[PDB]
Amino acid sequence: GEGVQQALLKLIEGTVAAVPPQGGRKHPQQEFLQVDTSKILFICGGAFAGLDKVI
Amino acid sequence: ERRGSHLGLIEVEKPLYCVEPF
């Protein structure tokens, strides 16, 4: 829960993440592809069952 | 170099249940 929210605070805003080595034809492993998530739109969907009462 | 990596555990708690005379 909260732990995942604390990990997205910089992914949703922007940071240089360390992508896992590879899932394709990339030969090296230590490459640890560096991508900037500061121009990546992030939609988030949920059902929030119970929020109606809070409101 | 072949090296293993450990992973944390669930970290479950031990709840208590109280019993009364009736």
């Binding site: - | 031990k14 208590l16 249940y17 019993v19 005379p21």
Partner: protein
């Protein structure tokens, strides 16, 4: 007010009553005047204990001034029926009914505290009505008197004649004296 105690195990913490906690340890309390409501409660405890472990002994603490004969016999029959041995411990006082249930414990597992007091006497009773009805109840109580003495002699190891003469009136027996009579086997003084 009965206090609440805690039992620590690798299942979770559980709060128990002082009396309920001791029930888990095969300990049953027999306190106050013997009657049908408390007798049925003790009977239920005995049947429940033998289900958990029918081999382990069941401890019965007796501190009572006596009670109804029918209620006591319910406990006596239940004790001699269940497979596990019933260990009787006398603390305080043990009257006619309390003494009968005390000596009814397993041979060699009857204990008494050093300052405990024991009393034995013939059963009491009475009936008001027609003469014909009195004879019916008079013979019934007499049968009980003889039946109780026979059982008392069996457990105490004495003769039926000695029991009748001694139980004619109130007879007070201390812990050391009860051992000679046969109502108990040993006396507990200190935890060795």
């Amino acid at each position: 007010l009965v206090p609440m105690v805690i039992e620590q195990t690798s299942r979770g913490e559980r709060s128990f009553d002082i009396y309920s906690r001791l029930l888990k340890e095969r300990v049953i309390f027999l306190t106050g005047q013997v009657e049908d409501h408390m007798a049925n409660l003790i009977v239920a405890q005995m049947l429940f204990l033998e289900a958990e472990n029918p081999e382990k002994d069941i401890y019965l603490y007796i501190n009572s001034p006596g009670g109804v004969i029918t209620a006591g016999m319910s406990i006596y029959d239940t004790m001699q029926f269940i497979k596990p041995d019933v260990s009787t411990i006398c603390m305080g006082q043990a009257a006619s009914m309390g003494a009968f249930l005390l000596t009814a414990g397993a041979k060699g597992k009857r204990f008494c505290l050093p300052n405990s007091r024991v009393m034995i006497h013939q059963p009491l009773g009475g009936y008001q009505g027609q003469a014909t009805d009195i004879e019916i109840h008079a013979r019934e109580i007499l049968k009980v008197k003889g039946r109780m003495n026979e059982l008392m002699a069996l457990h105490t190891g004495q003769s039926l004649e000695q029991i009748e003469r001694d139980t004619e009136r109130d007879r007070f027996l201390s812990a050391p004296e009860a051992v000679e009579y046969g109502l108990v086997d040993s006396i507990l003084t200190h935890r060795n």
